[PDB]
Each structure stands twice: as structure tokens, then as C-alpha cells.
């Protein structure tokens, strides 16, 4: 079948003039050269009912041939403690203690903590193999000494584990004890759990230097070349408070360690408090503190879940910034990825005369064509157009490498049809290690993916991609609006949501009208403040979309390419586990915007009402359409016509996700209600945010909440706001060769919003 053979990504999504973007490309095997050039994206949907694929080639200083090479990706979370001086390989006796919470205790060989070379069996490790906890030392002759626990581990049960090497008796010991309380584990204190053991074995060999770094939740692959240790045997589940002593321990010392008491503070070689650094702004850093006082500081790699429930968590406090001594754990999924860490292949400095628009780098390999999309900004402090188009990059990262149809059992039920998938979907399913996961996915443990990153090849960001729900979803669904603006005479700039996060409403106030992409599901708190400050003082905006401010997002402060979201009961794919609702990047709650008294109605007039993915509907004009205050919207439209009966996304305008009018959620009192969508099927449902008790008939055409609503309201200082409240609005613009009600209405509102007169008081 059609095999993908070339990949690649950017260091950053958005780049103004003068500044540099870097491109990191990989092939399957190191042979040949690839071609590259720069294109301007115009249109992405290749439906034969539409305009078809459109681009423009740009002469640039970028094109040429470059050597194709395979670039390896480290995949999965671990904490790395660099130790070049072999300070954590003791010459005599030592002991390793940690708390453990295993979610896949029977999934192969998993290393918990180690300074271990695995090409030559040297060093020491503490690992889970064949379901049991095993402590193994080794010298490098291949012949090792292990001690194996008696009782196998129960899944998601907190265990205290001490591994002791004692050369005075030539004896390895392993102490194991379960520390379940009323709240910390899978089951409670009612079971008669007998999973404690004290075992001992003979030590034949001595532990030697492994020339690697000390790792947490992993085993080192080979000797550390170029100052880098490769991690292979990834552990799934929480690890709390690890420590190495320079002396041997007895069973009384392990019994006191099991109760959370630091025995012998003079004998600690290192002691990593994972909760050290939690202030009132969360813990927005990868620095792991050695609390012993020796400067053996670690580093979180591939972003494990900072600020998680520890072994001593009882449920009296659920914010991690207020009780940090119970939030000292770290989750370590095996399929986390925040950066591919590949080597640069080429770069691009934006010229002085390049128009701010959507751009991509077309990689031309053997029989494979791959793109890498990026965005060109106007120069810093300037604006070269009256229209701004906010590209929805936070919701691009939320849907990055989305695998709902292969992983979720309810993937086909949410859509109203059997999904159709490309070769990009089978390449995501076959090579998961090169790509990562989406926030709509789960890990192999079950918990959803919180962190998503830009520095990875995102296979559904390319414009020739089609999505499992139906037609097209994130970036080609925005190229619908881009193609419509280019077909008419409108002159526009393009910004992203990372740029709006960086710049505030100062970016927005440079423009007369600010448009919105097809689906901006994810926003930060600062983006909502910037939009409210923009609309509050004379600003004009269009919300040509639905579900437009649903989940609260924070961009990581040290790593501007990593984005965090934590979810809850709502229109969700997962829910966060009980004490873990508060963000690591800032210690704030940040679930959905509606639960924080910032519903989407409170800024944009309408907000999330219903979702469903079989086909779309059409709008029927409400009695406010014939009002003379809004005759400028309904100009060339007969008062008995359907609106958007036919389109490229689903087959109509009001469809795929719908927003409604609601004064109780914050809709402004002077909002007019122009039209509403009918003919929605039984697959469209009431969102869980609006239900008290689920009774039968919460469906399309059986409940009043299932509809879309086209609204308009005006603000002070000659501002205004117009919403169409549908994802499939923009997929209905180029219908009937741009001769329809949707393009006439959107063109009426866009011609009014760019005039120097104030927007009409309505």
C-alpha cells in the first residue's frame, strides 16, 4: 500500500519577518536526497464538488536538495540525573528506596530506577520483570546477581520498596510493603491484602560503573555517547520520593521508611523530592531538586505529569499548590513526547516582501510528498491589512495525531457513519513512536494525554488530509476561509493563537475586523481576556465557528511549544483522576471555560449546544431577520429562502457542532437572533453540560437545545460581533461556485465591518 517515507516539523508555528524558522526532516533510511520548496496554501479540500486543491509556488532562498537521513526519537517519560563522576555508583554498600504505583505491572520488562548499562550488563537497576520487582547488580562480564520478590505487584496499588546491596555479607536484599490507605489506591482498606515480603539472595558479582546517567522510570540502553543516555525499558505509573543511601539498611529502617520518615539524613547520597518547587504558580519547570544537599539535580524528559497524587494523599486538599507534601509524585507514561530532539536539516529567514498568509514547505522525496505548514506574521508592531485571521494553533495541537477511530470504541458511534481513513492514519497506527498521541487519546494506562507539542510531525495538519468524522477538520477547514478571502478582493493578515497569547489585545487593536478559524475549541485565559478587551472598546469580530472557547489551555512557560489541557465531565474524551484537576504550568483549576464563569456566550454571543457528525442542516430565518436594524446582513437574501442547504462539510451549513443563544450563560441583552438550524438527526445530542437527569429523547429534533443560532450584537465605541455558530459554515462558502446565501451573508457582514463608519447599533 501507499507508504509514507518522509516526515518533518518546525521549531515554531509562527514567524515574523527577519526571524528564522528551522525544519527537521526524517526519512525511513539514510539514502538519496529530497527536494524542498516553499508554497502558499490557498485551498485544501479536494472534493470534486468544490474548487479542488490550490497552491502557489514562491521563489525563495530555501529550495534545493538535502541529504535524506533517519533520525531517531526518544519516546516516553523519565527523569534523567546526569552523573559524570560516578557518584551514584557507590564502591561499597548502598540502598535504594522509593514508593511505587504500577499501572501495567504485567507489560514486559520495565525499569523503575537505574544506573544501568544494558548492552553490557553493568551497574545496578530496580525493575519490574515478569510481574515481580527485581533488584539486579552487574559488573560487565554478563554474569549478574538478582533478587526477585515473592509477592507479585497488584495494579495501581502503592508499594514501598527498598533494595539493599550488602558486600559485608555478600547479600542482596529486597523489602516490599504496601501502603494503601482510604484514598490513594485502586481498592481500599477492606480487602485482606497480603503483599509484603522480605527476601534475600547471594551477591556473586560486584556492581561496576555503567558510564550512563541515573534514570527514573527507565533503563539505560548503552554507554553514554555524546553526553546522551538512551532510555529503553519504560515504566508506566507513579514514582514518589526516591533516594540512595551510602550504607546498608535493615528491616527496621525499611519499616520506618515505609511510614514516610527520612532515616539517617547523613547517609543520603541523593534524595529527589519531586514536589520541591511547587509555589503558588504551580511548578512550571523540569528541574528536579536533590533535597539531600549534593547538587545531583535531575531533569524531567518528555514531560511527565508534574503535580500528581502521592502515596500519602488523603482527600482533604485537592489543589496541589496548597498541600504540596501530598502531591509529590510523577506519572511517567511510556508514550509521552514533547520534542523529537532531531537535528536540523535547513532553515529559512523570512524576506522583507513576503505577504502574511499560510505557508508550507513541500518536501519532494521518492514517491512521497510531505508538507510542513507554518505561518508568516506581519512585521513586529505593524499591520499590513484591515482583516486579521486567527489561526487556531492550540486546537491544532489538541487534535495533533488524533487516533480516535483506531483506539476509541465509541469512535464510530459519535460520528453517524463508518469512518474513512487515509494512509496517514495507518502510518500513525503502525509507527506510533515517531508521532505521539493526541489529547483526545488515552495513554496505554488509560489516562488521557494532557500535554501536546508542536515539535513532532503532525500528520493531520497537512492540507491534503481528510478526517474520520467526515470531510476535513482543522487546517484545511481553515483553508476554506482562506480560499474564500482570496477569491474575493479582501486583503488580510494571519496571526496564530500562540501569537495572541504572547501579544494580548495589542495585536487585535491594529485591525478593523478579526476573523476566527473553523474550530477554535481551545483557548488560553489570556486569549479570552484579549478578545474581551478588544470587543469592549470599539472592536469588530466574526465568530464563523462553533465550540469556540470550550477548554482552558496554558502554554508551558519554559517550553512555548508544549501545551497542557486537563479535562473533566463535559464534551470530553477523558476525565482527570480525582485530585489532579489543577494545571502544572500555573497552579490554577482551568477545566472548561463554562465552569469558571466565562462561558462562550459571555464574549461571542453563542456557545456550545450540541454535536453530531453524520450530515449537516440548514438555517431557517427567525422573525428578527426582517427587522430593519439588521437589513444590512440580509441584503440580497429573499425572506423565504433556506440558508446553506448544501455544502462541502457534511452537506449543509448548520452542522457538525452547534452553538445557541442563552442569556443565562452570558449572552448580551441586545443580541438579535437572525436564524436557526433545523433537520438534525438522532445522532446529534444534548451536551452533558446542560443535563440534570438524562431522560430519553435528548436528541436532534426531539429537544430544543439541539440547534444552531446566527446572532449579532453591537458593543460600545462602534464595535460589534457576529456569530454563525456552526463548524460547517465555512464549508458552504464555495458552494454553487460561490453563489449561495452563505457567501452573500458573510460578504455583507465583512463589507460592513471594514468601513470607517461605526458598526450599526443593534
Amino acid at each position: 500500500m501507499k507508504d509514507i517515507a518522509i516526515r518533518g516539523y518546525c521549531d515554531r508555528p509562527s514567524v515574523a519577518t527577519g526571524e528564522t524558522i528551522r525544519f527537521y526532516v526524517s526519512a525511513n533510511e539514510t539514502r538519496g536526497t529530497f527536494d524542498a520548496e516553499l508554497v502558499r496554501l490557498i485551498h485544501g479540500d479536494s472534493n470534486p464538488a468544490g474548487p479542488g486543491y490550490k497552491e502557489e509556488a514562491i521563489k525563495s532562498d530555501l529550495e534545493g536538495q538535502y541529504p535524506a537521513r533517519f533520525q531517531r526519537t526518544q519516546f516516553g517519560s523519565y527523569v534523567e540525573v546526569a552523573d559524570p563522576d560516578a557518584g551514584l555508583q557507590p564502591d561499597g554498600a548502598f540502598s535504594v528506596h522509593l514508593f511505587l504505583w504500577s499501572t501495567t505491572p504485567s507489560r514486559g520488562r520495565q525499569g523503575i530506577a537505574s544506573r544501568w548499562n544494558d548492552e553490557r550488563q553493568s551497574g545496578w537497576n530496580l525493575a519490574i520483570e515478569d510481574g515481580r520487582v527485581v533488584f539486579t547488580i552487574g559488573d560487565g562480564s554478563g554474569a549478574t546477581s538478582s533478587v526477585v520478590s515473592d509477592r507479585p505487584l497488584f495494579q495501581q496499588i502503592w508499594y514501598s520498596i527498598t533494595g539493599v546491596y550488602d558486600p559485608e555479607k555478600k547479600q542482596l536484599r529486597l523489602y516490599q510493603k504496601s501502603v494503601v490507605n482510604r484514598t490513594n489506591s485502586r481498592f481500599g482498606l477492606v480487602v485482606p491484602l497480603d503483599s509484603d515480603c522480605a527476601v534475600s539472595a547471594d551477591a556473586t558479582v560486584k556492581a561496576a560503573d555503567s558510564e550512563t546517567s541515573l534514570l527514573i522510570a527507565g533503563l539505560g540502553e548503552a554507554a553514554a555517547q555524546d553526553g546522551r543516555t538512551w532510555c529503553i525499558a519504560h515504566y508506566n505509573g507513579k514514582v514518589d520520593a526516591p533516594k540512595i543511601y551510602g550504607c546498608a539498611l535493615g528491616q527496621d529502617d525499611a519499616e520506618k521508611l515505609s511510614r514516610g520518615e527520612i532515616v539517617r539524613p547523613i547517609s543520603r547520597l541523593a534524595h529527589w523530592d519531586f514536589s520541591a518547587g511547587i509555589g503558588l504558580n504551580g511548578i512550571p519547570t523540569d528541574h528536579v531538586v536533590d533535597a539531600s544537599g549534593y547538587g545531583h539535580h535531575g531533569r524531567c524528559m518528555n514531560q511527565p505529569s508534574r503535580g500528581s497524587t502521592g502515596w500519602n494523599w488523603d482527600g482533604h486538599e485537592e489543589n496541589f499548590i496548597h498541600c504540596p507534601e501530598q502531591y509529590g509524585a510523577l506519572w511517567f507514561h511510556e508514550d509521552c513526547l514533547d520534542d523529537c530532539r532531531w537535528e536540523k536539516d535547513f532553515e529559512f529567514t523570512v524576506p522583507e516582501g513576503l505577504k502574511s498568509d499560510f505557508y508550507a514547505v513541500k518536501i519532494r522525496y521518492e514517491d512521497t510528498e510531505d508538507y510542513i505548514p507554518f505561518f508568516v506574521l506581519p512585521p513586529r508592531g505593524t499591520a499590513t491589512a484591515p482583516i486579521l485571521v486567527i489561526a487556531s494553533t492550540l486546537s491544532y495541537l489538541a487534535y495533533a495525531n488524533e487516533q480516535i477511530m483506531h483506539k476509541a470504541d465509541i469512535g464510530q458511534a459519535v460520528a453517524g457513519h463508518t469512518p474513512v481513513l487515509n494512509e496517514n492514519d495507518v502510518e500513525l497506527h503502525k509507527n506510533l513512536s515517531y508521532y505521539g498521541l493526541s489529547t483526545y487519546d488515552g495513554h496505554i494506562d488509560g489516562r488521557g494525554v494532557q500535554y501536546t507539542s508542536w515539535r513532532r510531525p503532525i500528520m493531520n495538519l497537512r492540507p491534503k488530509h481528510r478526517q474520520g468524522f467526515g470531510s476535513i477538520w482543522e487546517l484545511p477547514a481553515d483553508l476554506h476561509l482562506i480560499d474564500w478571502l482570496n477569491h474575493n478582493g479582501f486583503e488580510y493578515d494571519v496571526a496564530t493563537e500562540h501569537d495572541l497569547n504572547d501579544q494580548g489585545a495589542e495585536l487585535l487593536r491594529r485591525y478593523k475586523v478579526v476573523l476566527t478559524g473553523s474550530h477554535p475549541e481551545y483557548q488560553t485565559w489570556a486569549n479570552a481576556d484579549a478578545w474581551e478587551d478588544y470587543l469592549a472598546d470599539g472592536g469588530r469580530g466574526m465568530y464563523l465557528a462553533a465550540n469556540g472557547m470550550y477548554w482552558i489551555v496554558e502554554v508551558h512557560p519554559e517550553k512555548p511549544w508544549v501545551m497542557e489541557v486537563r479535562k473533566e465531565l463535559g464534551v470530553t474524551a477523558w476525565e482527570a483522576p480525582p485530585g489532579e484537576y489543577h494545571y502544572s504550568t500555573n497552579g490554577r483549576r482551568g477545566g472548561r471555560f463554562r465552569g469558571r464563569a466565562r462561558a462562550t456566550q459571555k464574549i461571542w454571543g453563542t456557545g456550545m449546544s450540541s454535536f453530531g457528525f453524520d450530515h449537516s442542516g440548514y438555517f431557517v430565518q427567525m422573525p428578527d431577520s426582517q427587522d430593519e436594524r439588521v437589513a444590512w446582513i440580509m441584503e440580497g437574501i429573499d425572506p423565504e429562502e433556506r440558508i446553506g442547504d448544501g455544502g462541502l462539510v457534511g452537506g449543509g451549513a448548520g452542522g457538525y457542532e452547534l452553538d445557541r443563544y442563552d442569556l443565562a450563560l452570558g449572552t448580551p441583552p441586545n443580541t438579535l437572533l437572525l436564524a436557526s438550524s433545523v433537520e438534525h438527526s438522532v445522532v446529534y445530542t444534548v451536551i452533558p453540560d446542560d443535563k440534570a437527569f438524562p431522560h430519553p429523547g435528548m436528541n436532534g429534533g426531539e429537544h430544543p437545545f439541539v440547534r444552531a443560532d446566527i446572532t449579532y450584537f453591537s458593543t460600545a465605541n462602534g464595535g460589534g460581533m457576529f456569530a454563525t455558530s456552526s463548524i460547517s459554515w465555512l464549508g458552504s462558502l464555495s458552494w454553487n461556485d460561490y453563489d449561495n446565501n452563505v457567501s452573500k451573508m458573510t460578504k455583507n457582514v465583512l463589507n460592513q465591518f471594514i468601513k470607517d463608519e461605526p458598526a450599526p447599533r443593534v
Binding site: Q412, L421, V426, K430
Partner: protein, 124 residues
Amino acid sequence: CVRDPSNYRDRSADWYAFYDERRRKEIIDIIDEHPEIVEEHAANPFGYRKHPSPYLQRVHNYFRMQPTFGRYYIYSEREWDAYRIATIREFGELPELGDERFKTEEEAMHAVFLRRIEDVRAEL
């Protein structure tokens, strides 16, 4: 005492087996007592401007919520040209594609529906 986790299994799976048995028997009784829903799905598998019958809806609600290991979907050799039926496999594995090609995706959807009804008949 509870000491060895391999002595214990998820005993809800016994009820899942019982439930799936009764649920498959109900579904083939529905397909035998209303044979026109197959032509209803053949004429319009999206239900575009003609929503499904409730019995076709009940058959869809059985088929669309099954686990992904072994679930069918539609592969695209060439978009808007050729469509095949593929079966989901494990991680790292290519799907097992069918043999018949199709022209539009409505034909592929109705063929997946017919193959699902053949598979629920074959297990009984």
C-alpha cells in the same frame, strides 16, 4: 487473604459474554422481521435528508459501539476513486484490506453494513 493477582479475573466479562449473546440474537431477529431497512440503508447510508427508521437505528446502535480490535473501516487507495474495507489490527500492524474496490464511499459503507450482518449471522 489476597496475595496473588493472577488468582483473580474481571468477572464482569461473564456478563459481557451473556449480554453479547442475547444482543446478537435480538439484532438478527430485527433484521429478519424488517427486511426493508437493508434497502433503506443502501439508498442513503448517511441518512441525508431522510433520517433512518428506528429499527435501522437500533441495528446501527448495536454495530457502532463495538471494540476496535476487529472493527471494520474504509481505506482509501485513491480518494474519490477507490475504497476498500479494512480490519483493525494491533499496534505496529498494517490493516487487513479486503478484495473488492468501490467507487464512492456510500457503496463502501453499505458493503461494510452487509459484511457486519454476515458476521453476526456466522456466529450463530
